[PDB]
Amino acid sequence: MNHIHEHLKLVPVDKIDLHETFEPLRLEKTKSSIEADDFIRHPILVTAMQHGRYMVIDGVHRYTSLKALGCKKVPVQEIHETQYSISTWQHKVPFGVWWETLQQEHRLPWTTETRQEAPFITMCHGDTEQYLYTKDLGEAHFQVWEKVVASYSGCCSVERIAQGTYPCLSQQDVLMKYQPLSYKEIEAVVHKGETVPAGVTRFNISGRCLNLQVPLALLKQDDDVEQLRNWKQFLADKFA
């Protein structure tokens, strides 16, 4: 039962990478909660990249909070490729002016055609569907995410929806959908020192370690040798 235990590590903040940006306000709510509790409840789930680097796949705000507090290291659970898959959050907002505003500002090749290829992006309004096909985009298809998301996101209150066929088909509502990125794509983004718009990607992860309640005082211990001691003992007291 110590599979989890074996994969809890104390990783330096400077060796962890983000593929999304963080919302500035979510950070201060998380950081305030952690300080009020004086412990970080959940460990930051990461996936191992090459050269001793790691990518956050859950706990962006936890990571950035501890980093802001000056924690040299953060508690992570290393996840394996077998344990998690990648998906996407569907965005539901009300249809509005931003659709035309987006159209003339960027003039993307929206089409009604239902091709043998899968849509890179989908726009649902009524019983109609408009798509982007990565071929029509060709190059500059890395950036279109930021352009499509930024249009409605800001003048609309976004509502995240999972692919469980849970939408209400309002006559007036629109539903944005994004093709999931492969792991290779996300890795490249991180390698280029780049990011993608937050609130789109969705990591479905199994075998998660929850409610570890790592005390802040431990993560604030400047002395390295002593920090490992209390940490290793902390993982001893709490079996996994």
> Which CATH number covers residue 167?
3.30.1760.10
Rounded to whole angstroms, how far apart are CA atoms 228 and 224?
Answer: 6
Reading the block at residue 178, the tokens are 């994004």
* Distance between first and last Cα of the chain: 8
Q: How many CA atoms lie within 13 A of 131 on its CB side?
A: 14
With beta carbons less than 8 A apart as the criterion, state whether 37 and 212 touch: no
With beta carbons less than 8 A apart as the criterion, state whether 196 and 145 touch: yes
**Enclosing H/E stretch for 27:** helix 24-37
Query: What's the resolution in A?
Result: 2.5
**b/e 126-154 (16+ beta carbons within 10 angstroms → b):** eeebbbbbeebbeeeeeebbeebbebbbe
Closest CA to 212 of 79, 84, 76: 76
Would you call 62 helix, strand, or coil by DSSP? helix
Closest CA to 55 of 21, 20, 16: 16
**DSSP strand pairing (173-178 vs 54-58):** unpaired
Token pair 């931003």: residue? 98
Q: 23 exposed, middle or buried (CB, 10 Å; 0-12, 13-18, 19+)?
A: middle
Closest CA to 112 of 96, 97, 132: 132
With beta carbons less than 8 A apart as the criterion, state whether 175 and 126 touch: no
With beta carbons less than 8 A apart as the criterion, state whether 93 and 155 touch: no
49: which residues sit within 8 A by CB, 6+ positions away?
17, 55, 187, 190
With beta carbons less than 8 A apart as the criterion, state whether 4 and 240 touch: yes
Does the annotation count 129 as an active-site position? no
**Enclosing H/E stretch for 183:** helix 183-191
C-alpha dihedral (208, 56, 16, 81), degrees to nearest 10: 70
Token pair 């989890």: residue? 4
What method did the depositors use to determine the structure? Answer: X-ray
**DSSP strand pairing (128-132 vs 44-48):** unpaired
Q: What interhelical angle do 24-37 and 60-68 show, nearest 10? A: 70
With beta carbons less than 8 A apart as the criterion, state whether 96 and 156 touch: yes
Token pair 């659709």: residue? 99
Reading the block at residue 1, the tokens are 């039962």
Reading the block at residue 223, the tokens are 């002395």
Catalytic residue among 20, 23, 129, 159: 20
Domain residue limits at 129? 87-197
Tell me how crowded residue 170 is: count the other CB atoms within 10 A of its CB.
13
Rounded to whole angstroms, how far apart are CA atoms 157 and 92?
Answer: 9
Rounded to whole angstroms, how far apart are CA atoms 177 and 34?
Answer: 33
